[PDB]
RNA sequence: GAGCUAGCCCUGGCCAGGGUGAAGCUGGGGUGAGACCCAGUGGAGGCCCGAACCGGUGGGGGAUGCAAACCCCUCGGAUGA
RNA sequence: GAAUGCCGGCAUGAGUAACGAUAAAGAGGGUGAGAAUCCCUCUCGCCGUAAGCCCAAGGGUUCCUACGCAAUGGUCGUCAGCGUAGGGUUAGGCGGGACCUAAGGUGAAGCCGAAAGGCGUAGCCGAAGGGCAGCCGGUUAAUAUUCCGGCCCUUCCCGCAGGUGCGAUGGGGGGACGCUCUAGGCUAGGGGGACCGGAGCCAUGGACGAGCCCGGCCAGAAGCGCAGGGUGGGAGGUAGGCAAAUCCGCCUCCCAACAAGCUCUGCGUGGUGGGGAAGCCCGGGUGACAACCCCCCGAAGCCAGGGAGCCAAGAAAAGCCUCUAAGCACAACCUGCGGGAACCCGUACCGCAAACCGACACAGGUGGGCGGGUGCAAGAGCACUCAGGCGCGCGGGAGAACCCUCGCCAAGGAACUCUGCAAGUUGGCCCCGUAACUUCGGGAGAAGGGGUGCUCCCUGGGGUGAUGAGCCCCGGGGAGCCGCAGUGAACAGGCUCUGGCGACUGUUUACCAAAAACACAGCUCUCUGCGAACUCGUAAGAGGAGGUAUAGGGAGCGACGCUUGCCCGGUGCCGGAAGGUCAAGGGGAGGGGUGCAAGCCCCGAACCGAAGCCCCGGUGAACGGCGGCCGUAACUAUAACGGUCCUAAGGUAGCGAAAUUCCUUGUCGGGUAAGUUCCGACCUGCACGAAAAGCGUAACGACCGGAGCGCUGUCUCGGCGAGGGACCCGGUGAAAUUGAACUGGCCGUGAAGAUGCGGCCUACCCGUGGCAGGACGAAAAGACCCCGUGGAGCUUUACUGCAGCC
RNA sequence: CGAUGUCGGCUCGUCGCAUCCUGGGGCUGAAGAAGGUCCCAAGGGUUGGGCUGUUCGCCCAUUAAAGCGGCACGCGAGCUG
RNA sequence: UGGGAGAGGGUGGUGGAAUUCCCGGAGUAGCGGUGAAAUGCGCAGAUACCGGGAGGAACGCCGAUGGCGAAGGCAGCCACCUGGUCCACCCGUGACGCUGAGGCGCGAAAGCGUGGGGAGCAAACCGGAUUAGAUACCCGGGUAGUCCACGCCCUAAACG
RNA sequence: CCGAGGGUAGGGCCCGUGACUGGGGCGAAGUCGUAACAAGGUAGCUGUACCGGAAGGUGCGGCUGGAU
């Protein structure tokens, strides 16, 4: 049947993207936390 | 004069429609329509604040003139009478001799190709608008301002009307469509005559679908829900209300008055409503 | 977290073919005028049959599956909420 | 040494299940160390509203070529969506941006919030919507509306000519709109041709034919022709379109009017440029100077912003046009012509799937366009088949039980069983014919029945065309032919009678419930006078609603028909400016502490003092409730009648062994040979009853009862047959489970159900196909029950708080 | 209670005997026939239907007869539900 | 042709008396009701009186033993639209008439549907008396209805 | 070809019968009340409506076949 992952690049960028994170206090702490942890990528890769 | 259908389907049994006899023009004045934003009963939070709304036909709002004192002494001609999907009443299109065009709500008996006008010296003739202090006591009247220059607020719905019962100082006394007696300031404008389309209430929707066309989504009973949802929720099998009948939010709903007690307008309401 | 799901908003798209034949309209009869009757025209509808599409009624299979809900047969809706 | 411990390793089950749709394969020839599996050929089968072709999303080199086979591929592999390498994506016109707005988002102004932040007008952003200039062919191993060829077009800059009051982010017009039905004329596409072009063919009995087979076009600027859309002209007045205005709007007047004219689009033609089959021979060459014509069918697409009807009344903004304002009228704009200028990103490949979403090359899911032909009434249905694409990445044998899917069956025909579950039967079209009841539509495809193919003859109407031929579309009549059978294959209702429930179409527990549940039109109560009530929010602010009592909220009931009785003592709500009670505060009789004293300080009665509660009333489609005992009639039996106790009042109409009846299979009647079910009645209703509505109701229902007819492998009662498995051989090779095991029966015993203890009996060692009685077999630390001063959801006249409200 | 699946049916049986029938008997208030009661006896047999989920029971038509119990109210790694 | 009387009918208007309710004033201890009472209302200020307001229904006197209509029926006043009828003149048509099965239309009250309206009245219903009982007569309340619009019903001691 | 009739299916009319049910007629001496006839002790009758063990009552309108 129809499963839960239905990829959509605009959706992905506008939801989890860098600019989305930066707009929100909660978003910025996510970036802060992932940098502190040393994540190679702070944000989901999407080809735009 | 409502139109009926033959029983060629189960819903065409009882379904009735307006006759649309008074209508003379079937597509709106383009300079007087602007888009109506359908809300779905949701506020700027995204939240439903009025349950069971949405999914109705698309509509264009028609800008109505509810402050006819705008143009005192300038007569206008009744160009046409049109359908308005945003209200129960019909609307009338006016060609002012000024060149300007406006919509007003159509009073009962208003005929196309007649002059109407607004102001203190206006004739007491169906369609004209005056301050209440210049309208003869006993005259039925609609689209009444509740405060001077604030706009017509009272008696707007199809078939409705207010009657002037007397005067007292700067104020006149009106019997509202509801039966309430109220003082309204003399300077408040109002249009002589009753609103038209009085057969509006005799329309039988006929099926669930006509409700949906009007933007009315299904209404679910408290009794049909669970305790988490509603006071009437739950019960094993059917159940009487089992407590005083209440809204979803707990307040009682058979008889509990809700008009704020210390409201300043109380000084101006002579007698609460009938029936 | 509403890329699943539920509701709403904005903007687009889709519904083979066949059947029934409402109002109205025209003509004819009727009457003081009417109601109304008959025929023709007409093409209404949460109308009918049935693909696409949307479903999931009954049964069988499957049951370390092809599948963490599937397959076959049958069945519901199909201009409408 | 144990924790269903943790990490790792390796066993068992076992050479076992399985190898992923039953659309299907066989041979020959190549390549190579090696071939059922790679390449080629011939044969065979499958898809063909796709299992073919083109977009979009998502994927991200998977594309092409060479060289490879360790792993990946459910087998193999020389092959590959795999490994290594090199190559491959070309745009002013396609899509997006340098244009416009939609919801929504953001947000100068402004509002609000302890902080973080939330709002918010304009503006800005935001698309699969608006707007905007490219079609046909050729070429590469791989790109092409992009390269090339032909013919077209847009914007910007500058210049020239001609014309004009030029000029705007401002005014106005326009853009600009729904649903259903639908006209005329075209085009897409298709069928036919005895006409035109073609390599060839004559078989096996016949045919050298008016024979078979193949094909008979595509694009195109101006002009022209056909068909459409859009659109009145002039003048005078003018206070409105937030300055102005010659524009627009309004009024008057003349002319024009189903037209014309002007303009815009589609189509045809059109200079020119392309294409071009079968077959033969090696993707190419020939065919070929290829021919490129006639008739018919014909869109849902085009003309298009067409027309009609209807109610539920159907985006915006820019481009474009007009008006003017500052300003400037050496300018500036408009038109035509010329040269110049024209940027950024996408472009490979997959794309109903082995490349996307499902851990897999996974029988699942995935939006848009094209989707040919013949026949069946139509069609995207169904059977076959074109182009095109496939035979589904284990095979070979065998011909057992059993399982799955399928075919048939003597006589019987529901006797099966909880149940006709299942499977038969019926089945399309045309014609005849069709009941109770009904809300007059329906019920209705009721029921039942006749026809249905092919041949010859006669004839009727329509479309095209020309009025005719030809072609095509509907028919009527007569005479015959064949078979068991003519919707000869495929797709295609079994029917009726009678109850319960729900009016109806709808809706629901994604993944055990589709229903009698929810919804529903409709009825009633109730709140709400608008800065409405109500709802979300601390707020601002929103929804309500740019609505105004014929409206909006809440509640119950649930089409319609006929109806909805009595009780207001209690609870709720509603009314009652009195009385009672009543907090902070007012008041300060009268006390207390301290000081030498003024004083400073504390307690404090009466009395005044809100809502709330008390008290007085109202109110049932508000929460709710609607009796007991005893007696009485001239046969008996039974009580219309009476007595008395109690209650706020004692169940009214209708219905009743019921979706409700315990006793119960009540009793009687019907149906049956037989009826705990069903149907109709009776009424001692354990324990119906009137909007948690009462009693009915045509129509409707994948709802739940009962009966009959038809027909059946459901059954008596089983038999045979087909294919896919199961079986044997070659290849690959799991799983849960498992203290170790050298693991028999009886009767006992044992923690009470023993392979394991006792006595006896029986038994050579090891397997394979089978069946499921045991191993208190496996799986899940029982979901029932209890226990825990464990948890959580829910309720209320449990406690105590908080929002909110007074 | 770190699970011993719980009614009934179907299928397949097997055992007990306190015997329903068939065989052998004694007593009889046994004339014959047909019965009654008790004894011996488990070899074989012990029907098809209507109703209900039923076991059971009632009922129809038969019969030599239409037996009663055990096997985890025998039997769901056998089926049904 | 010329005249007359009339509550004949339909439509739109409009007048005063009275009942009830509401606000104000003034005022106190009862009012109401009956055969007698009680229920009921009244110190929360009733009844009675004055002023103001809201609304519905019916039209006193004229009024009669009257008039009009085919019947049912029709009563303030005004206007509009309309029916029948009688009298005068003796002018016109020249038997054009009577009746009338079916048909069609009208048809008091009650009652029904959909809206409205609602003062008074009043089935049902409640309460107080009476009574052996009192599902009545009498008293206090009171809902349909009585009123309007449109549409049905079509009955009657529709009687002379 | 027609054709008696036979068969399948569906209708219409009539008769007989049916648990149970509705009222009706009749029947020497049952029970309850007293509605009508007198102003019948509330004048009666009336069409209709609602109510009530029963006769009846009440509303609305109508008749005198109503006493004084
Ligand atoms: K339990
Ligand atoms: Mg889903
Ligand atoms: Mg997942
Ligand atoms: Mg999605
Ligand atoms: Mg996207
Ligand atoms: Mg996208
Ligand atoms: Mg998105
Ligand atoms: Mg989205
Ligand atoms: Mg976001
Ligand atoms: Mg983002
Ligand atoms: Mg922060
Ligand atoms: Mg920060
Ligand atoms: Mg890095
Ligand atoms: Mg992130
Ligand atoms: Mg109707
Ligand atoms: Mg009708
Ligand atoms: Mg109208
Ligand atoms: Mg109209
Ligand atoms: Mg606009
Ligand atoms: Mg809006
Ligand atoms: Mg917003
Ligand atoms: Mg709400
Ligand atoms: Mg809503
Ligand atoms: Mg309107
Ligand atoms: Mg005011
Ligand atoms: Mg209504
Ligand atoms: Mg609407
Ligand atoms: Mg509603
Ligand atoms: Mg509801
Ligand atoms: Mg509930
Ligand atoms: Mg529930
Ligand atoms: Mg919740
Ligand atoms: Mg709660
Ligand atoms: Mg609650
Ligand atoms: Mg409850
Ligand atoms: Mg419940
Ligand atoms: Mg419930
Ligand atoms: Mg219950
Ligand atoms: Mg209830
Ligand atoms: Mg309760
Ligand atoms: Mg409550
Ligand atoms: Mg509140
Ligand atoms: Mg009020
Ligand atoms: Mg989505
Ligand atoms: Mg459809
Ligand atoms: Mg038909
Ligand atoms: Mg027709
Ligand atoms: Mg028409
Ligand atoms: Mg339909
Ligand atoms: Mg299924
Ligand atoms: Mg089946
Ligand atoms: Mg799952
Ligand atoms: Mg499963
Ligand atoms: Mg399936
Ligand atoms: Mg199928
Ligand atoms: Mg079907
Ligand atoms: Mg259908
Ligand atoms: Mg269809
Ligand atoms: Mg639609
Ligand atoms: Mg240990
Ligand atoms: Mg552990
Ligand atoms: Mg571990
Ligand atoms: Mg491990
Ligand atoms: Mg290791
Ligand atoms: Mg290992
Ligand atoms: Mg091994
Ligand atoms: Mg094994
Ligand atoms: Mg396996
Ligand atoms: Mg498999
Ligand atoms: Mg298949
Ligand atoms: Mg196939
Ligand atoms: Mg071969
Ligand atoms: Mg082969
Ligand atoms: Mg090989
Ligand atoms: Mg090999
Ligand atoms: Mg090959
Ligand atoms: Mg060969
Ligand atoms: Mg095809
Ligand atoms: Mg398709
Ligand atoms: Mg991937
Ligand atoms: Mg390999
Ligand atoms: Mg290999
Ligand atoms: Mg290698
Ligand atoms: Mg591998
Ligand atoms: Mg695989
Ligand atoms: Mg090799
Ligand atoms: Mg490439
Ligand atoms: Mg180009
Ligand atoms: Mg630039
Ligand atoms: Mg804060
Ligand atoms: Mg954006
Ligand atoms: Mg766009
Ligand atoms: Mg649009
Ligand atoms: Mg473009
Ligand atoms: Mg072009
Ligand atoms: Mg350009
Ligand atoms: Mg401009
Ligand atoms: Mg428009
Ligand atoms: Mg518009
Ligand atoms: Mg429509
Ligand atoms: Mg063309
Ligand atoms: Mg064709
Ligand atoms: Mg010929
Ligand atoms: Mg050919
Ligand atoms: Mg051309
Ligand atoms: Mg001007
Ligand atoms: Mg000019
Ligand atoms: Mg050549
Ligand atoms: Mg289309
Ligand atoms: Mg168009
Ligand atoms: Mg149009
Ligand atoms: Mg906008
Ligand atoms: Mg100059
Ligand atoms: Mg110009
Ligand atoms: Mg640039
Ligand atoms: Mg490309
Ligand atoms: Mg593709
Ligand atoms: Mg698919
Ligand atoms: Mg597709
Ligand atoms: Mg592929
Ligand atoms: Mg999966
Ligand atoms: Mg595969
Ligand atoms: Mg073809
Ligand atoms: Mg067909
Ligand atoms: Mg295969
Ligand atoms: Mg396949
Ligand atoms: Mg094999
Ligand atoms: Mg074998
Ligand atoms: Mg198969
Ligand atoms: Mg055979
Ligand atoms: Mg047979
Ligand atoms: Mg049979
Ligand atoms: Mg038979
Ligand atoms: Mg049966
Ligand atoms: Mg059986
Ligand atoms: Mg069943
Ligand atoms: Mg068939
Ligand atoms: Mg019939
Ligand atoms: Mg019948
Ligand atoms: Mg019926
Ligand atoms: Mg009928
Ligand atoms: Mg049909
Ligand atoms: Mg024939
Ligand atoms: Mg033949
Ligand atoms: Mg020819
Ligand atoms: Mg069918
Ligand atoms: Mg029948
Ligand atoms: Mg239901
Ligand atoms: Mg239903
Ligand atoms: Mg019902
Ligand atoms: Mg019903
Ligand atoms: Mg309903
Ligand atoms: Mg319903
Ligand atoms: Mg439907
Ligand atoms: Mg479910
Ligand atoms: Mg669930
Ligand atoms: Mg569930
Ligand atoms: Mg679920
Ligand atoms: Mg689930
Ligand atoms: Mg299921
Ligand atoms: Mg259910
Ligand atoms: Mg269903
Ligand atoms: Mg539900
Ligand atoms: Mg419901
Ligand atoms: Mg109702
Ligand atoms: Mg109400
Ligand atoms: Mg809140
Ligand atoms: Mg608004
Ligand atoms: Mg009826
Ligand atoms: Mg009745
Ligand atoms: Mg009470
Ligand atoms: Mg009370
Ligand atoms: Mg109370
Ligand atoms: Mg001292
Ligand atoms: Mg109570
Ligand atoms: Mg209770
Ligand atoms: Mg009662
Ligand atoms: Mg009653
Ligand atoms: Mg009973
Ligand atoms: Mg019974
Ligand atoms: Mg019942
Ligand atoms: Mg029940
Ligand atoms: Mg009961
Ligand atoms: Mg019991
Ligand atoms: Mg019982
Ligand atoms: Mg029972
Ligand atoms: Mg019985
Ligand atoms: Mg009986
Ligand atoms: Mg019987
Ligand atoms: Mg009894
Ligand atoms: Mg109930
Ligand atoms: Mg029914
Ligand atoms: Mg029915
Ligand atoms: Mg249904
Ligand atoms: Mg159903
Ligand atoms: Mg049966
Ligand atoms: Mg069988
Ligand atoms: Mg076989
Ligand atoms: Mg062997
Ligand atoms: Mg091997
Ligand atoms: Mg392998
Ligand atoms: Mg051991
Ligand atoms: Mg051992
Ligand atoms: Mg052993
Ligand atoms: Mg052994
Ligand atoms: Mg023991
Ligand atoms: Mg033992
Ligand atoms: Mg042993
Ligand atoms: Mg041992
Ligand atoms: Mg031993
Ligand atoms: Mg020992
Ligand atoms: Mg032994
Ligand atoms: Mg073996
Ligand atoms: Mg074995
Ligand atoms: Mg076993
Ligand atoms: Mg077993
Ligand atoms: Mg164990
Ligand atoms: Mg076991
Ligand atoms: Mg076992
Ligand atoms: Mg499990
Ligand atoms: Mg645990
Ligand atoms: Mg446990
Ligand atoms: Mg557990
Ligand atoms: Mg326990
Ligand atoms: Mg405790
Ligand atoms: Mg404890
Ligand atoms: Mg606890
Ligand atoms: Mg829980
Ligand atoms: Mg808790
Ligand atoms: Mg246990
Ligand atoms: Mg365990
Ligand atoms: Mg276990
Ligand atoms: Mg013997
Ligand atoms: Mg024996
Ligand atoms: Mg038992
Ligand atoms: Mg048993
Ligand atoms: Mg029993
Ligand atoms: Mg014998
Ligand atoms: Mg036994
Ligand atoms: Mg036992
Ligand atoms: Mg037991
Ligand atoms: Mg057992
Ligand atoms: Mg089982
Ligand atoms: Mg069992
Ligand atoms: Mg087991
Ligand atoms: Mg076992
Ligand atoms: Mg069950
Ligand atoms: Mg007093
Ligand atoms: Mg006092
Ligand atoms: Mg009033
Ligand atoms: Mg008088
Ligand atoms: Mg004369
Ligand atoms: Mg009448
Ligand atoms: Mg009343
Ligand atoms: Mg009524
Ligand atoms: Mg008289
Ligand atoms: Mg015969
Ligand atoms: Mg007949
Ligand atoms: Mg009688
Ligand atoms: Mg007697
Ligand atoms: Mg008497
Ligand atoms: Mg008396
Ligand atoms: Mg009397
Ligand atoms: Mg009584
Ligand atoms: Mg009475």
Describe this structure in words.
- The structure is cut from a larger assembly and holds chains A (48 residues) and B (275 residues).
- Chain A has 48 residues and is mainly alpha-helical.
- Chain A contains three helices and no strands.
- Chain A has helices spanning 9-16, 18-23, 25-37.
- The longest helix of chain A has 13 residues, at 25-37.
- Chain B has 275 residues and is mainly β.
- Chain B contains one helix and 17 strands.
- In chain B, the strands form five sheets. Chain B has a seven-stranded antiparallel β-sheet, with no helix packed on it. Chain B has a four-stranded antiparallel β-sheet with strand order 7-6-5-8, with no helix packed on it. In chain B, strands 1-2 form a two-stranded antiparallel sheet.
- In chain B, a hairpin with a 2-residue loop joins strand 13 and strand 14.
- The chains hardly touch.
- One magnesium ion binds at residues 16, 21, 30, 43 of chain A.
- Chain B binds five RNA strands through strand 12, helix 1 and strand 17.
- Tell me how many strands of chain A there are: 0
Q: Largest sheet of chain B, if any?
A: 7 strands, antiparallel
User: Using DSSP, what is the number of strands of chain B?
Assistant: 17
Q: What is the ordering of alpha helices and beta strands of chain B?
A: EEEEEEEEEEEEEEEEHE
Q: Give the quaternary arrangement of the chains.
A: part of a larger assembly
Order of helices and strands of chain A: HHH
Q: Radius of gyration of chain A over alpha carbons? A: 12 Å
Helix- and strand-based class of chain A?
mainly alpha
Helix count of chain A, per DSSP?
3
Report, as a whole number of angstroms, the end-to-end distance of chain B.
27 Å
Number of contiguous helices of chain B: 1
Strand content of the residues of chain B, in percent? 15-25%
Which band does the percent of strand residues of chain A land in?
under 5%
**In angstroms, what separates the terminal alpha carbons of chain A?**
28 Å
Can you list the ligands bound to this structure? potassium ion, magnesium ion
Radius of gyration of chain B: 22 Å
């Amino acid at each position: 049947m129809k499963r839960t992952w239905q990829p959509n690049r605009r959706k992905r960028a506008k939801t989890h993207g860098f600019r989305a994170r930066m707009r929100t206090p909660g978003g910025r702490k996510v970036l802060k936390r992932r940098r502190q942890k040393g994540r190679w990528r702070l944000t989901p890769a999407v080809r735009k | 004069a409502v139109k009926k259908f033959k029983p060629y389907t189960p819903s065409r049994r009882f379904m009735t429609v307006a006759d649309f006899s008074e209508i003379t023009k079937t597509e709106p004045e383009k300079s007087l329509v602007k888009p109506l934003k359908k809300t779905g009963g949701r506020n700027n939070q995204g939240r439903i604040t009025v349950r069971f709304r949405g999914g109705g036909h698309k509509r264009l709002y028609r800008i109505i003139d509810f402050k006819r004192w705008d143009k005192v002494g300038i007569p206008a001609k009744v160009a046409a009478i049109e359908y308005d999907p945003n209200r129960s009443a019909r609307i009338a299109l006016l060609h002012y001799v000024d060149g300007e065009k406006r919509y007003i709500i159509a009073p009962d008996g208003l005929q196309v190709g007649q002059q109407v006008v607004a102001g203190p010296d206006a004739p007491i003739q169906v369609g004209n608008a005056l301050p209440l202090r210049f309208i003869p006591v006993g005259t039925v009247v609609h689209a009444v301002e509740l405060e001077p220059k604030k706009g017509a607020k009272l008696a707007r719905a199809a078939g409705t009307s207010a009657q002037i019962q007397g005067r007292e100082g700067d104020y006149v006394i009106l019997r509202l469509p509801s039966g309430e007696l109220r003082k309204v300031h003399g300077e408040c404008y109002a249009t002589v005559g009753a609103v038209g389309n009085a057969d509006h209430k005799n329309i039988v929707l006929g099926k669930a679908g006509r409700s949906r066309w009007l933007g009315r989504r299904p209404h679910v009973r408290g009794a049909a829900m669970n305790p988490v949802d509603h006071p009437h929720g739950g019960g094993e099998g059917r159940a009487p209300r089992g407590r005083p009948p209440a809204s979803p939010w707990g307040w009682q709903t058979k008889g509990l008055k809700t008009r704020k007690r210390r409201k300043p307008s109380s000084r101006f309401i002579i007698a609460r409503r009938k029936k």
